[PDB]
Symmetry: D2
Subunit: 245 residues, 4 copies
């Protein structure tokens, strides 16, 4: 399988390149970076590409890939409904091509979102604390925003979190994601971490995921790369790829 | 509903007494303590009793209760297979009577065991850290031992945790519960806490439950008390009464 | 020693009342609550009063106390420079009277602020996460704000925390306290908790304090109550009371 | 300054080699590995060597280095009193040569031991939890054992930790290091982590250090390498080179 990496120079990209180069069943056909022509992909006859670039260019590359029938495993965050809809209104005019987008390829993270959904109804309060390296451009993380959305969707009928906050400094209570407060920590020495807190009478439940190394995203990426053709079109998250694993 | 409390003087017992006394749909019929005759129960026409005593007496009281057809919601730990088996038969001679035993009545704890079971297969390493007040007689906690057992049972076909420990101080690697290391911390200022750690390539997953107050066990207890008659015989755990599997 | 409690009905107040009532060397002379005349204090010939009321009334009571020469151990938060200055411009016109104000009476908390000050210079990043019960009116906590101030004051010559945040949801990065981000979590089941995070190349340092029970403030309060007369005027924090202990 | 690395192939060694190679003021004179002759050091005219090998060989290399007057910054754990004593004399016959041994070069770790010493007296209970990668040969970690020793030494006059443990599974309460329980966790995905827990009435204090990356040891190592000649003889720890006492 010929595989090319979009953003091969990035923190995550360089890792994926190393991973694909080590995969005995995969062939690194392309190593695109900022500026390099998207034609380099069609040159190496790439069939699947791993995208770990920037939200300002994803939509751009996604058009090219979907055109030449090249499959795509995208990790680049900042995917909005309109964008998904964009990607949607494209695959239709060129099926047989598969595209997978996931806010997090770490298995522990996917499991965290899974458990968060299940525990939400049993508690009065729910908050999300996300912590990342000081090089992250977006706050809060895509995963945090998605986790908050999942929680808020599971507590549909229930009342909102209890909060007697009368006086407060601007921003002290974090960002509001569908009624669920989300706090973003940018600290040196960190990579990718998340904490989901549920609280009730005399007890709390904490589901924490820690990505100590960027290699933690490899397994999920390669898994999606190999079984990419299994599902045509868009997928979103890698939950379907292992809900039975 | 007439409800009596066994061990009404204990740390947990005094809380249950207060809870039952506040329950508008429940009547505190008995407040037994160490020494007090089990006949006080039959005196107040008790139909259900909450047991939070000591493992050295549970079996004793359980016989009396099961005889007079009184239902029992037991929280007292130290329940072994033989003990469970014993109680099993005890009721077979007196059906129509219900008995529920649970290692933990905190919902977060029950959920922790639920999630632990589901995540076990996805990781290479698994360990349990349990932390309690310095007044606990047993180490590790009943919940910890049960959680470790659940994890070990979910990883049936998989190899054991990787460990290159060559030299070590006695007891440094905690207790072995079916191949899963369990560490017991006894610290002042704590109540009931547990941490389940799963580890793999570049990432870890932590599921932590915190019982900051003993009132956290009330909801689970009262829930079992009210729906006690729903399931005749012996029931181990709170899961059956919960939506989860 | 005759001791009266201001706000004897509050979550913390009721605890202090119980504590003073148990102190064999202390006499509970007053149990004021909302509405009750401040004259009840002068009635029982109170010499020291524990204040755990509300920031909207502290200044009021503080005037009365300082007038009748009654000593005061205040725990009520929301103490600003002007207010301190107010309390300052009063004791002068009536010395021989002592007043102690502390943002936190938990020893672990005081120690946390102590360590935070010492570690600040050794790290690139520093952030504060504070977590409290959903009944707290102010965000962030007084202790959190004070800890952030201490940290920012210790890193005087050093550059600010590195942060590449380009796009962000309003409030995601918490409140800014002298360049130190502070996050406030309001969750059910919690009491008083704080986490100080320091980060640098490949490592982080976390100093966490947990007030699982309101009784944790008793030792510090009573300590200040007994040795109150030792220092005339205002003090601020109970660091001087044990920097040598 | 000519610097050679002992164990240049190890997890930590390869990092130090990369670090020294990047240091504009340092020259990588040697890259010894298992088997390679210690004479390679005398070949490149090495003046200082970084040792990150194995406790079974340290004593061996230390003799050679101290003989040829080569300075040594040793990170290899497993240093016992007898071993320290031995090295002591080894240098007495060859002064003018400096040797520094430290159980941890991460600044956060050194600070942790510093704070642990200061907080010990203020609490009833104290326990240490250490967590490392599943490739560590010794349990508990050298740092954990040292931290436990420091704590036990600071609580000289005070009574031991309160523990009502009557029944227990073998090893559940961790290893005993001078009366301080130490728990060792070996999990995949981890690197080097430690947690010091202090407990008292209604509150706990946690001092946690996290080495997410092995690069975290570089700063401390290079600092000791450059200022090595400053202190003739043997030096244990990094504290001397630091502002702290
Ligand atoms: N879903 C997941 O599991 C994960 C997602 N991510 C997300 O992936 C993205 C990047 O990760 P990270 O490595 O930290 O990011 P980087 O800051 O390292 O940026 C990655 C690479 O993309 C580049 N690049 C930019 N534009 C193009 C382009 N048009 N064509 C090809 N290359 C381009 C960069 O070049 P230059 O910088 O010179 O412009 C850089 O080399 C973020 O959105 C991040 O949140 C990260 C980890 C995991
Ligand atoms: N399943 C769960 O969710 C939970 C289970 N537990 C378990 O429940 C038990 C209680 O712990 P905790 O309440 O903190 O401990 P305590 O010892 O504080 O409470 C125990 C009470 O039982 C007593 N008692 C002893 N024997 C009898 C008897 N035969 N008849 C009635 N009273 C008796 C005691 O008296 P005296 O002390 O004078 O002997 C004491 O009042 C433990 O086994 C604990 O592990 C605890 C919390 C939760
Ligand atoms: N420094 C420290 O270690 C700690 C400080 N605090 C601080 O102390 C304050 C309160 O603690 P908490 O118990 O949670 O608060 P509560 O919400 O329980 O309020 C406390 C009591 O003060 C009352 N009170 C109000 N005004 C007066 C008045 N003028 N005269 C006397 N009584 C009055 C209340 O009555 P009503 O509600 O009916 O008006 C209530 O009974 C807060 O500022 C909190 O942040 C808390 C813990 C520790
Ligand atoms: N003080 C501190 O801050 C730190 C201390 N340490 C300690 O340092 C040591 C290193 O751990 P780590 O690097 O992860 O382990 P590794 O085993 O990955 O690194 C050890 C290296 O030393 C080797 N080597 C063995 N004997 C010799 C020898 N006689 N001459 C030179 N090379 C030799 C190895 O070869 P081979 O494997 O083939 O035998 C291996 O390359 C441990 O004792 C660890 O506890 C670790 C981190 C920090
Ligand atoms: O959901 C996210 O935005 C996310 C998840 C993991 C890592 C990163 C990152 O390194 O930027 N971002
Ligand atoms: O599973 C247990 O043994 C357990 C759970 C909660 C509290 C206690 C306790 O207070 O002893 N013990
Ligand atoms: O610094 C604070 O504001 C503080 C500290 C401890 C407890 C509380 C509280 O219970 O409101 N508030
Ligand atoms: O004190 C120790 O033994 C220690 C400290 C950091 C890392 C390691 C290690 O990687 O073995 N060991």
């Amino acid at each position: 399988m010929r595989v090319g990496v979009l953003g091969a120079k990035g923190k995550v990209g360089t890792t994926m390149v190393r991973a694909v180069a080590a995969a005995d069943d995969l062939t690194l056909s392309a190593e695109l970076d900022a500026g390099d022509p998207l034609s380099l992909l069609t040159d190496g006859n790439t069939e699947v590409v791993i995208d770990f670039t920037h939200p300002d260019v994803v939509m751009g590359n996604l058009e090219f890939l979907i055109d030449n029938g090249i499959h795509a495993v995208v990790g680049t965050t900042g995917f909005t409904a309109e964008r998904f809809q964009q990607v949607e209104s494209w695959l239709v005019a060129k099926p047989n091509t598969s595209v997978l987008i996931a806010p997090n390829f770490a298995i522990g993270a996917v499991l965290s979102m899974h458990f968060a959904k299940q525990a939400a109804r049993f508690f009065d309060s729910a908050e999300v604390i996300e912590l990342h390296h000081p090089h992250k451009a977006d706050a809060p993380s895509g995963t945090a925003a998605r986790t908050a959305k999942l929680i808020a969707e599971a507590r549909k009928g229930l009342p909102p979190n209890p909060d007697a906050t009368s006086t407060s400094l601007p921003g002290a209570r974090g960002a509001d994601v569908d009624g669920i407060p989300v706090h973003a920590v940018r600290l040196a020495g960190l990579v990718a971490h998340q904490e989901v807190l549920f609280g009730t009478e005399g007890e709390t439940l904490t589901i924490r995921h820690d990505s100590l190394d960027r290699t933690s995203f490899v397994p999920g990426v390669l898994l999606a790369v190999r079984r990419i053709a299994e599902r045509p079109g868009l997928t979103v998250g890698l939950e379907p790829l292992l809900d039975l694993h």
